């Protein structure tokens, strides 16, 4: 249904956001390929990550997952049996592409299928480079579409130049070369998420990191690990921006992932002039982690573009909200080179936030967000089934004088169950904090 | 409680429609999907297997509409089979697996097949190797031998195939794959085998050539929509034929039964034994021989069963065994699972008080023997042994308990209902 | 949803129609109440009868059912135990009404509920009389609607007179009478379905009957019977009317129930001068059964009214079709489901027939050839869909029959049996 | 199944434990009888508490619920309609007893049923008093077992005396006495959970207590409240105890409810001397809530019985573990089900601890370092498995715990919260 949302008198307390999706996926896949038991804490246990588990369980690996905790009794490649079942990818694009790399590594036959939606997402960009490595891959629309059949094994390294930049593709090819013979090299136009690169090293593998081109030597051995999964930045960002905007706020998000390739918001917040702080910075993967603390801030407009855009793409709608309370003008530029799935978000956020009373319009390559503007409520705003719009809108409502009806909150409860619960106990602690 | 108590029958009178033929039901649907025009199946077997065949072809883009025993298959040639976005689920059906493979090899896109646990243990390599020799890219578990299998069907070149094994499912696959290949495709085997695929395909407007031991198809001909009235499955029909032959005061008409000689082996044994049997209304529906059989309490003579016949009556050996117990003198049947069948058939009938004995390649039955109840007989989860025992219990003085009845209820749900119906009609006609 | 139906060149063959729904219900119920095993052949395995089985199992009766054969390890009243589960009736009007009577006998607590459909049908007509007999019954809308709660036990016989004519009602009270103290008597306006009467006798209970008045004494035993369920004339009727009208037809329907309170269709056929044979009359458990043979006849219009209407109600839609091919005026009157008559009229009329409704029924006229090429709906009522289907067998140009799911649910093999009849005619000719 | 647990290096952090079961049940129930909307926060979305929601949804009440957040559109008693469905109570004893009360209020027919479990639990101790009030209740075993049928309405108050202490039974009769005529009274040999009284007071109803006897006039009006459900002391107990035992530990437990009728372990903590802070002392929806803070403390053995025992019954397993590390003769004594305590002893001595069993309670002696390397079962009981789990955080070498799949039911994230305290002391440890 809908949620009606009042304005917040304040936000205070500590919160653990649910663990990073990308890291949780990889923590599992890598543990399966490794020798000796891997354990996973802070595991994001959603449909996609549960799909990954199910897939490897069918490949023979003994995995026990109990809420946020996972234990993977890996025995290396030598203990992955040929599946007598179809591997069901569910809704996970991550699982599909990375496991396509891994299955090309294996000297047996496998079939991949997922749901309605995954059968419209093109896979050709990944099957082609893998056929090049010596992998027999056929499927719907000549291997472009689900379902896909795969026999791998005796695989050969490859240098590979790529036109479009994509982290999932990279990760597939890297995992495939992990059991190949010789140099396997990936090259892209943009730099992009390094989770595969980082986590591999924490498992006991060496990668190249050469400028714009990453490479791997097969065949190295993966060992069992103890993986503490960092919080998802994308989920933290909702609270960070709330903490910044909402009067009388002081929020501490613990164990948040700080991977420079995804923590672009943390740079935006800082340059806008947020009272932001990091604490206890570590490297738990692989991945850098910190405890973020924000409190009510006086913000300023900031021009955002270039190499920053690729590193904060999920935080565009929430930054749109944040900019509403910043003095002067903020600009998003170089969004022209974004998927229609993201160009649509921008367009709706623009109109949703306008319904809420802000000065904001769409541009050729992003949006301009103008002035500090008090948001007025007494209106319905829709999440359009996109959890990122719902959530951003949800926190935008915390500033609105008069009630705001956010509809389509179903999509939020799917992705991030306790979003409103966490929000509610920040409002409770702040009300319990004002006493005589 | 998985056991029925079966009392001796005082008589058996009536008419019965046994369930459709499984082989013909499958193919009606399949060849339907390959033809131009509306095929209409009547008396179709709505079992799990045949329902699986329907499903796979729906998943291939073919419009198919099924109620109870009535099927409609709409259009539309090869030109209307679209590349599946779903896994084609074969379920339990060996037939769907094997025949559809032949057909899938004929199509220029990608298909996957899987089934349940059972099908995932049955070796397919016997079919996949031939089709690969025709040009088909077929991979699968255990190097294309076990489910799940993946199929890409390129431009297909014909083949002169030779096989050490006699297999009708294997033959069907290659003939079907030969349908849209170029240049004559031929299968040769040791024994002559079931000929449903050739007959029906022939009735669907296709031409098969037959030079004894070798069958061949010239690609690529058209198939036309047909009205297929599925004939009664003889294996089921056999159980009534035998009961009717034996129990005093019996007379059973069985309407519209597939009479095909590659499976009608029991019809020739009945004749040989001097059973009172009648064929009436024999015609041919959509390639398949069919007539209504009528049988009455007979005076049977022992006979030798062996050679060519065995293939064409294999499934009836258990019931034939019972038929034999009532024939005068010796009746021999000669020529892993077949031997396990034979043994328990022998075992059971023996405690019913028959003189039957097992041999290396079959069994020997002696004389006319009154069967006796008061014993519990088991089917070891074999519907064929179950039913055959059921019928034998109809002869025994004292009651006979037949454990393992749920196997029957799965193959032939209305089997005991049909028996009961004949038992009652005989008591109602006994108004002297 | 639909079926397209062409005219029939002929209909030849034998059919076993499904068990009578009413007898099938009762043989389970009486089996459960009786000492000794009861066995049931020809049982109708539809959703309703299975609900009946479901319920008595929850009362603790061992019942093993497969296709059309039931076994009931009946062990008497002593043998029914207090349910820990809710008794679920699904969609079954019979089960609900009758079980209410039975449960008013049993000295413990029980709860009845059904689906949405039963949850709308009123129960006051049965609950009120049983309450006056001594049973504690409460429920939604002051015991008028499910869920109903019942504590039965020590009942005292009533002399019941009703303004309604209902066999479920009569059966409830008669069943409560079985263990009630003294004499329970039901007097009804019309006479009605007497299956409850005939089967109590077949199970060994002395039931006294004047006309319209039936009485019963507690507390007689019931003995396990072997029950052969007769065919529903309700279904047989579609095939009898089919045989009567379609040229080149010769149909035999085996083991069909001819109970006179329900054989109204036969009276009409015979009065219309149909070529009807009733062979092998028997009585199976107090139930008159016979083999019927019909062949293409030259029917005449007849006047259907008065005492017969009650005996042929469910068959009015099919008789309406029958009258379409009869030579002359045929009147149905003294009827008062009055919307059910009207759809029959509407559809048949757009089929080319010459029907009209009256206030007391309808008037159908002459032998009218029927023109297809048009679409007619069952309106979820299965009987309209089957009447319409066999009407279709007679019509030049095809007829689409909307809502064949309803048919398919209540008579799965109905269209297959038709096919089989048309098939066999092709072979002869 | 089973989970392997090594020793704890140290426990540091802030934790919000799940909502209180009893308050979650009541928030919905009372909200359904109230006039005007009732919003609940901190709701425990367990099986039992969702069963309450189910039941009132079938009584006509519009209720939205999503994870820990619940909205109840109350329209007073007049808004409850006669049910067309059976009221399904699932496995919930609370729901069963407290609804029998509420339904007795209602001038229509209603049927209750639950699982094989509820089906075996006696109800005569609740239905008999309710009938005295004018309620008509029939059911299996002469009103003593599920399913039960009820028609209510015209109710007259009763002076009721119970020979058995039961919160549920008290709650039922009070709830019925909310729409009865005159003064309804309940008197029982001991005093037990008083959540019904507090909540009702908070929803605007006058409950008069004269120690031992509670009484209510009717009909008073219930008004829609904002109800922040406090954390469950029974589940906070497992973290207070672990904190007091593990070397270098300092844990804050946000918004835990401090009801004296269940805060027995807190009295035991301060009597054992353990360092225990108590910030933010406030009363919320009639319930007293506080923020608890425990650090690693020196434990002293203490005598426990009679006065303070009835109000800590569930915590006995966990307190038995807390005594393992307390110096000296620490004994609990009262038998008044108690089969739980029998099993605790077997497993603990198996770990290498000093516990014998006595006529009513048990003896615990000295501070004993526990040894690990054995399998301990909980027999499907969650209160053991949890106590047994946190116990294993002291002994080294794997201490395999069984019945863990029963823990994941009453407390989904128990082992997660636990894990998060170990690994946040990995990150607090940097010079």
Curated annotation (Swiss-Prot), chain D:
Gene3D superfamilies per the UniProt record, alphabetical: Enolpyruvate transferase domain
Gene: aroA1
Subunit structure: Monomer.
GO BP terms in the entry: amino acid biosynthetic process; aromatic amino acid family biosynthetic process; chorismate biosynthetic process
GO function terms (MF aspect): 3-phosphoshikimate 1-carboxyvinyltransferase activity
InterPro entries given in the database record: Enolpyruvate_Tfrase_dom (IPR001986), Enolpyruvate_Tfrase_sf (IPR036968), EPSP_synthase (IPR006264), EPSP_synthase_CS (IPR023193), RNA3'P_cycl/enolpyr_Trfase_a/b (IPR013792)
Residues binding 3-phosphoshikimate, per UniProt: 21-22, 26, 166, 168, 314
Pathway membership: Metabolic intermediate biosynthesis; chorismate biosynthesis; chorismate from D-erythrose 4-phosphate and phosphoenolpyruvate: step 6/7
Keywords, alphabetical: Amino-acid biosynthesis, Aromatic amino acid biosynthesis, Cytoplasm, Transferase
Main location: cytoplasm
UniProt cross-references to Pfam families, sorted A to Z: EPSP_synthase
Active-site residue list: 314 (proton acceptor)
Protein name as catalogued: 3-phosphoshikimate 1-carboxyvinyltransferase 1
Family: Belongs to the EPSP synthase family.
Role this protein plays: Catalyzes the transfer of the enolpyruvyl moiety of phosphoenolpyruvate (PEP) to the 5-hydroxyl of shikimate-3-phosphate (S3P) to produce enolpyruvyl shikimate-3-phosphate and inorganic phosphate.
Reactions it catalyzes: 3-phosphoshikimate + phosphoenolpyruvate = 5-O-(1-carboxyvinyl)-3-phosphoshikimate + phosphate
């Amino acid at each position: 249904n809908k949620t009606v949302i009042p304005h917040a008198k304040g936000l205070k307390g500590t919160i653990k956001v649910p663990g990073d999706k990308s890291i949780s996926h990889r923590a599992v896949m890598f543990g399966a390929l490794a020798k000796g038991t891997t354990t996973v804490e802070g595991f994001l246990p959603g449909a996609d990550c549960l799909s990954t588990i199910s897939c490897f369980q069918k490949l023979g690996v003994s995995i026990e997952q109990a809420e946020e905790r996972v234990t993977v009794k890996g025995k290396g490649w030598d203990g992955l049996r040929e599946p007598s079942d179809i591997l069901d990818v569910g809704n996970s694009g991550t699982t599909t592409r990375l496991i396509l790399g891994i299955l090309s590594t294996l000297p047996f036959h496998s079939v991949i299928i997922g749901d309605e939606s995954i059968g419209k997402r093109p896979m050709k960009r990944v099957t082609e480079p893998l056929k090049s490595m010596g992998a027999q891959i056929d499927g719907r629309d000549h291997g472009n579409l689900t379902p896909l059949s795969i026999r791998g094994g005796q695989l050969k390294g490859i240098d590979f130049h790529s036109p479009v930049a994509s982290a999932q593709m990279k990760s597939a090819i890297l995992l495939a070369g992990l059991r190949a013979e010789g140099k396997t090299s990936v090259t892209e136009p943009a730099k992009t998420r390094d989770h595969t690169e980082r986590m591999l090293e924490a498992f006991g593998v060496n990668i190249e990191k050469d400028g714009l081109t990453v490479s791997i030597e097969g065949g190295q051995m993966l060992t069992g690990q103890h993986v503490v999964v960092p919080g998802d930045i994308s989920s933290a960002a909702f609270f960070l921006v709330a903490g910044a905007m909402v009067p009388h706020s002081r929020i501490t998000l613990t164990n948040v992932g700080i991977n420079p390739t995804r923590a672009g918001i943390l740079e935006v917040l800082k340059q806008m002039g947020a009272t932001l702080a990091m604490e206890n910075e570590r490297v738990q993967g692989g991945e850098p982690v910190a405890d973020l603390t924000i409190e009510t801030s006086v913000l300023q407009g900031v021009e955002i573009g270039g190499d920053i855009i690729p590193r904060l793409i999920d935080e565009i709608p929430i930054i749109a909200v944040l900019a509403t309370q910043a003095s002067g003008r903020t600009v998003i530029k170089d969004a022209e080179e974004l998927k229609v799935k993201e160009t649509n978000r921008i367009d709706t956020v623009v109109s949703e936030l306008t319904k809420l009373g802000a000065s904001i319009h769409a541009t050729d390559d992003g949006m301009i967000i103008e002035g500090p503007t008090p948001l007025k409520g007494g209106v319905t705003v829709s999440s359009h089934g996109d959890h990122r719009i719902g959530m951003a809108m949800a926190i935008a409502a915390l500033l609105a004088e008069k009630p705001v009806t956010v509809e389509g909150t179903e999509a939020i409860a799917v992705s991030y169950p306790s979003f409103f619960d966490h929000l509610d106990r920040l409002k409770s602690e702040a009300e319990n904090l004002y006493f005589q």
